[PDB]
Amino acid sequence: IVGGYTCGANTVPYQVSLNSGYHFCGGSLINSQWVVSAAHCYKSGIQVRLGEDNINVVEGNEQFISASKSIVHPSYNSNTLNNDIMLIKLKSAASLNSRVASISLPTSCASAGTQCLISGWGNTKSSGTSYPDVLKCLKAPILSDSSCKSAYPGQITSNMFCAGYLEGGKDSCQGDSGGPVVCSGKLQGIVSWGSGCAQKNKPGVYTKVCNYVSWIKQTIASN
Ligand SMILES: [Ca+2]
């Protein structure tokens, strides 16, 4: 997250860190045994880390649970990042409390102008690199589809939306991928891609979760 603020320990209780010996992507807890992330975060041997603030210090609220199964969306296209969404099933159910909690799926798509919360442990610089150890937060609005397509000609599908600031300075970034975009207490987006980070006229692009609620619910119900 570039230009954000320190969330505070366990103030984003649905935020997960995906770990393969190191943090490499975010994700969102959507019930006690399932996590949603980005398909471009796929790898084998994922450990899901819940209840994290400082990802380099054991602080006492963590739950570490291995993935038993990963399901990349059937139509994921790694060249265009269309359908950039993946489901991860935990080997055992998480213990839910005030600091580890699930985020609700949306019943409707959010409109442009809605304010959302984006969070992650990604890079905090637009040039160069600095990775934080504690979770960072950013409040940002959903941009109109017209602004989004004008910023990224020929690249925005109906499964993507833009959020952020056309002036630049505030954005998600590398290492935030897979993490949540929450608006009005519902999961509306997944950190997916962008050109650089926090660059003028290049806002973040996010997977549009409301298009996938049917697939998510059907998949969870039979796996
Ligand atoms: Ca920790």
UniProtKB/Swiss-Prot annotation:
Swiss-Prot/TrEMBL GO biological process terms: digestion; proteolysis
Disulphide bonds in the chain: C7-C137, C25-C41, C109-C210, C116-C183, C148-C162, C173-C197
Annotated control of activity: Is inhibited by scorpion cyclotide trypsin inhibitor TopI1.
Stretches that traverse the bilayer: none
Location(s) in or outside the cell: Secreted, Extracellular space
Database matches in Pfam families: Trypsin
Keyword Protease: yes
Tissues expressing this chain: Synthesized in the acinar cells of the pancreas.
Family label: Belongs to the peptidase S1 family.
UniProt name for this protein: Serine protease 1
Organism of provenance: Bos taurus
